[PDB]
Structure formats: structure tokens, C-alpha cells
């Protein structure tokens, strides 16, 4: 988990 990962919707299923 990275709190600063930039993807906003990509990583949501």
C-alpha cells in the first residue's frame, strides 16, 4: 500500500 499512489479510479474494482 502506498498512500501516494497516483491512480484515482484505476485500482478500484
Amino acid at each position, epitope marked *: 500500500f*502506498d498512500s501516494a*499512489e*497516483p*491512480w*484515482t*479510479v*484505476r*485500482n478500484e*474494482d
Partner: antibody, heavy 118, light 113 residues
Framework: EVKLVESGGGLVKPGGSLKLSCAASGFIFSNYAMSWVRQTPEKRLEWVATISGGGRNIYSLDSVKGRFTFFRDNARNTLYLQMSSLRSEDTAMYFC???????????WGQGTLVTVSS | DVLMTQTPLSLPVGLGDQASISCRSSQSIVHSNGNTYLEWYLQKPGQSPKLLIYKVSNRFSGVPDRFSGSGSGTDFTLKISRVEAEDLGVYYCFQGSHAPYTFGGGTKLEIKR
């Protein structure tokens, strides 16, 4: 509906600076992360950076850190790429692309060409 | 860094026939959230790349069922069940799991007239 249009590409001397823009329409811009992807003259694709919807979280190529700045103006539906200390390796077609649920580069623009040359 | 090894470099195929394009990653590309962000793009002549497949095997909206993706861990394959002239261009695999994100070198599909 969804439209992405890059601009600002052109000729710049090695060590020079250039600002690229990406204009977006047809969706709620700040709801989506945006990426910059470049295509080299040998036609390889290279991911350059990804920036969050709100514009404060960024992943980028280590080779462009300290040289390129990524940011967006969500009030104007525009993504920016501020290039400085340009190198010959930066010569490429630059594409902007919007993410979507489950996929990284869902919509692409037409690209803008950057030539780094004396 | 994750190297993506994509083969063949080009592929001549008759109209109506099948093609398989392979992609291997130099290490596992399972994202921290358990998903595998392996994607396939097609760049047609004179166009930008467009999304075909995401999360290894999911077809993007509008993409014909002729295209299917498979694989896991480090080995992935794009399969085209029967080729049409509109399928001409360069296919690229991409991993979005581990930064810096990386593309395969591409496969040029050609029609065997």
C-alpha cells in the same frame, strides 16, 4: 464526448525548456488520474508519469526527476508537462491519456511532437 | 525494474486465421492490491495506441470477442481468434503494477495476402 488534445510540441535546443499542454473535455476531469506516455523515434512506448485526479500525487520516471514537472489545472480541464534540461533521449511524440476503473491508459490524445536538436 | 519481453517482433497471418502474441515479464507483476495490471494496446497506422485488454483478460468496451488475453505471474498471451484487415498495426503489452511502468517492444501484425 471524451476528448484529449495535446499541444505545445516543437523544436528545442538541448538544455532548453518547453511546456506541453493537454486539453480535456467530455468528462469530469478532476475525477481521473492522467498520464503522459511518449513514443520514441524507434517507435518504442515509454511511460513518463501519472498524476492523481487532485494533482498532488505523482509517479514519474527517475530519468526525468529534477527536469520535468507534472501538474494540472482542474479549473481549466488542462494537464501540463513542463520540460527543462531537455536531452536528445527526450525526442518523442508525447501523448496524454486518461485512466479508468481497472485500466491505465483508457483514452488517448493524438500526440504532440517534441524534437530536441541543435 | 520490470523488463517486458514481447515476441514475435512481427507476425504475417492470412485473413480469417489466428495469431498469438506473447509477453514475458522479468519478475512477478502482481500489484500490491492483488490485481495484475497487464494490458494490451493496438496502434493502427497513423493513429494513437488504443486499449484492447486490461487486467490480463478483460476486454475493453467495443473490443470484439476475437481478442482474448490470458496468463499469470510472468507469462501472458494475446490471442486473436481470426484476423481482419482492420487488425493491422503494432500490438504492445504493458505492465502497470510496479513503477516505473514498462511496455513490451511491440509486435507488428501483417496480412499474408
Amino acid at each position: 464526448e471524451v476528448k484529449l488534445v495535446e499541444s505545445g510540441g516543437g523544436l528545442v535546443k538541448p538544455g532548453g525548456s518547453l511546456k506541453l499542454s493537454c486539453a480535456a473535455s467530455g468528462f469530469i476531469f478532476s475525477n481521473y488520474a492522467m498520464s503522459w506516455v511518449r513514443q520514441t523515434p524507434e517507435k518504442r512506448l515509454e511511460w513518463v508519469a501519472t498524476i492523481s485526479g487532485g494533482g498532488r500525487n505523482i509517479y514519474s520516471l527517475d530519468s526525468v526527476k529534477g527536469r520535468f514537472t507534472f501538474f494540472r489545472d482542474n479549473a481549466r480541464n488542462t494537464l501540463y508537462l513542463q520540460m527543462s534540461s531537455l536531452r536528445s533521449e527526450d525526442t518523442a511524440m508525447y501523448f496524454c491519456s486518461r485512466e479508468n476503473y481497472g485500466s491505465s491508459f483508457t483514452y488517448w490524445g493524438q500526440g504532440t511532437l517534441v524534437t530536441v536538436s541543435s | 525494474d520490470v523488463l517486458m519481453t514481447q515476441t514475435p517482433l512481427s507476425l504475417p497471418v492470412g485473413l480469417g486465421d489466428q495469431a498469438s502474441i506473447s509477453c514475458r515479464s522479468s519478475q512477478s507483476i502482481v500489484h500490491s492490491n492483488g490485481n495484475t495490471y497487464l494490458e494490451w494496446y493496438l496502434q493502427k497506422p497513423g493513429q494513437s495506441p488504443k486499449l484492447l485488454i486490461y487486467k490480463v483478460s478483460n476486454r475493453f468496451s467495443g473490443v470484439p470477442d476475437r481478442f482474448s488475453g490470458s496468463g499469470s505471474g510472468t507469462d501472458f498471451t494475446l490471442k486473436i481468434s481470426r484476423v481482419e484487415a482492420e487488425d493491422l498495426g503494432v500490438y504492445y503489452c504493458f505492465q502497470g503494477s510496479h513503477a516505473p511502468y514498462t511496455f513490451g517492444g511491440g509486435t507488428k501484425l501483417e496480412i499474408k495476402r
